[PDB]
Symmetry: C3
Subunit: 240 residues, 3 copies
Amino acid sequence: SLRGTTQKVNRIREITAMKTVEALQISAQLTQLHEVDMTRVAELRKKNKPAFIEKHGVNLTYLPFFVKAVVEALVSHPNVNASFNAKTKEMTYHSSVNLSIAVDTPAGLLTPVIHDAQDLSIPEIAKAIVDLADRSRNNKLKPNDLSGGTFTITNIGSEGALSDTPILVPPQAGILGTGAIVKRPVVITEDGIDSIAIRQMVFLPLTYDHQVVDGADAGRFLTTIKDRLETANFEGDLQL
Amino acid sequence: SLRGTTQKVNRIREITAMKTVEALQISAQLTQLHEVDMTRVAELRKKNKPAFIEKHGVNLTYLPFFVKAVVEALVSHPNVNASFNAKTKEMTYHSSVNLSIAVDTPAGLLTPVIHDAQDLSIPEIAKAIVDLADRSRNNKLKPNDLSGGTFTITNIGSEGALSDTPILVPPQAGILGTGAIVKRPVVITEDGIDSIAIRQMVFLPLTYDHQVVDGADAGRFLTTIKDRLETANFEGDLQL
Amino acid sequence: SLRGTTQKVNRIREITAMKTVEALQISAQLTQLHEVDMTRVAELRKKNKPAFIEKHGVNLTYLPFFVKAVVEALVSHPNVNASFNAKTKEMTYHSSVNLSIAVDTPAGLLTPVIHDAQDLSIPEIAKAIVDLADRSRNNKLKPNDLSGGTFTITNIGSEGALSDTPILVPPQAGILGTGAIVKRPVVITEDGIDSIAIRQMVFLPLTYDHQVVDGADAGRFLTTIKDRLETANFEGDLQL
Ligand SMILES: CC(C)(COP(=O)(O)OP(=O)(O)OC[C@H]1O[C@@H](n2cnc3c(N)ncnc32)[C@H](O)[C@@H]1OP(=O)(O)O)[C@@H](O)C(=O)NCCC(=O)NCCSO
Ligand SMILES: CC(C)(COP(=O)(O)OP(=O)(O)OC[C@H]1O[C@@H](n2cnc3c(N)ncnc32)[C@H](O)[C@@H]1OP(=O)(O)O)[C@@H](O)C(=O)NCCC(=O)NCCSO
Ligand SMILES: CC(C)(COP(=O)(O)OP(=O)(O)OC[C@H]1O[C@@H](n2cnc3c(N)ncnc32)[C@H](O)[C@@H]1OP(=O)(O)O)[C@@H](O)C(=O)NCCC(=O)NCCSO
């Protein structure tokens, strides 16, 4: 029991405390928020969940769709998949997308990495997330699993949040949160008629480092992700 | 008249300027946002307002309901009612909930404290808020009224805001804002039917220090508060 | 092509990286968010767009309406059109409103200034924005165009964002973002009846420096802007 005691924090939480305090002091963080209509992805996921778990052995969640769209956008917007050397004033644009994934564990938050995520299909991403989350929760990560990330995705919606202002950790330039996907009434406009529909909506807060990305660059990057998700042409990508 | 002059700032505003600049540099602040359906609380408040002011002598606002739920959640999530000693790497989990309440005054913002708020009923909380706000506005606070807080609640909705990213002040680990409670169209899902209802909704932004609380801990804490408020089993708590 | 290279950043981006990192360390930034019903302004803009471009020579966007309301509010709330000298603890309340406007350019974000914006009509503001954006994009700004700002407006909605937490740059005390104006279902309450209407809504995030502005001051300032925009008495102001 913790109430009424003073205790040394565990090793995961000691590193998190030092890294997050320092990260804010050596970058210029801000969080831009876009809304995305996830209805088509939600319909595709519900329809294909049984066939996906039968063929690939893991449950199909929303996270592999967010990962696929974000990784494609990091290839299309290489200025976001980049790091700034504040001493030399040089930007390095990475040729791999090594995608960090935040994992909640009882001992603390861990952020393992999917290396070369740009080469992965949706089934490969789904399996990799399940593997890294299981190894994070059971003390089986190696140093290469926790280093080399070029961008991070954090599932803030897992515990119900609509949004957050996640802390990025240099040398990364961005961290995207996937808010809780919620049914909401929204306006549709088609043929000059405005009307109210029920759609599965999500907020995507992107914390970006203003040293690397300006606000309009963040918006163009998030627009690429939004359009990919809203069109939801992922049937082929599921390999079912 | 202020326009076109240069003047020394008053004592309240000098301390606020120094404390807030320093607070951000010695913590890792981020703000997670959840939405809560306040309809049942709003109905209970409207129904019982006359009996409450008759028996307890103060107007019944939303703030005592937010205080009751937050204080219960600070007891249930002792990891949030805590402080981090960055020199020793030790966490202290406080056995009292001393709840700071932000009060807007013409001379500046003051943050007096309701000590041992965990022992208070809703009528006691309502009276304590009225007392501290009156003493803040009339120069009658003592040093013990302004020290010892373990968490803060700030009514950002008083002047119309939906949300904010409030600044926490170490050694506290969290500050919760109560946004403006607004009627909104929302989706209800029951019996497999999705439908649109008008509900009194609020956003609750929580700024937390990542040295003390990870994002999933913040979400679990806010979920406890959300469920308590949405169920709205406070009839007995009003003592009417 | 950038992917797989390390290159020196351009002059605009070098200054932006240094200025934004420093700005956060010498101020106490937080972002308060209000929602505003832009339907009446959108109707007035659609109705008068052809006559405005015919008489004044520039397209009428939403930005001149936001500028007019913000500039009036900076005159009415001189405490926001101000700077803090942290060495002397003195506040200077500026007698001009020199309004910085963020401009996205291919070489990087530039923030030129509309000096003495308080003396300008909506047609003058529209022309000044077009002039400064064209000169920012074609290397024709002078040092006086980039200095002396007392507040900034940044059009975060240009690239689709609903909101952001813009970084203010001392000695300014506030930066207001104009989110994307989107049709949304909202609740109207009139004659004791609650009902759902389709309205053009916008989020206005204001980043303010807590050294200069407390949360309730930010709310009162944003309320003045919200009421001016929602009433939308700008017909005369268009000079058509
Ligand atoms: C210079 C400027 C501010 C001018 O903005 P503007 O006055 O809105 O002009 P514009 O870009 O020509 O407007 C194009 C259209 O978009 C509309 N629009 C622009 N902003 C909008 C918003 N927030 N919501 C809805 N519509 C918007 C305009 O009304 C105009 O509509 P029509 O074609 O139907 O008349 C803009 O070009 C720009 O650079 N914006 C980006 C600022 C920036 O980079 N900020 C940094 C933080 S994030 O971007
Ligand atoms: C490892 C992982 C990211 C995996 O997430 P995941 O791929 O969504 O898997 P999961 O937790 O098994 O998903 C459980 C269910 O919730 C759903 N879900 C998860 N996130 C969701 C979201 N943002 N919106 C809606 N539904 C969501 C999944 O689709 C799945 O649904 P079904 O049971 O109907 O198929 C997650 O367990 C986790 O640790 N999240 C927290 C991350 C964190 O702590 N971040 C720090 C900042 S705040 O939390
Ligand atoms: C001291 C206090 C917190 C007390 O707040 P309170 O308990 O809500 O009392 P109040 O101001 O008398 O309430 C007036 C009315 O507004 C309502 N109200 C207050 N906050 C509300 C909110 N978030 N949403 C909806 N209604 C609200 C109350 O319920 C009450 O309604 P009725 O008159 O219908 O009964 C407040 O006066 C204050 O100072 N708030 C500002 C705090 C501040 O400056 N924070 C800094 C960050 S931004 O403001």
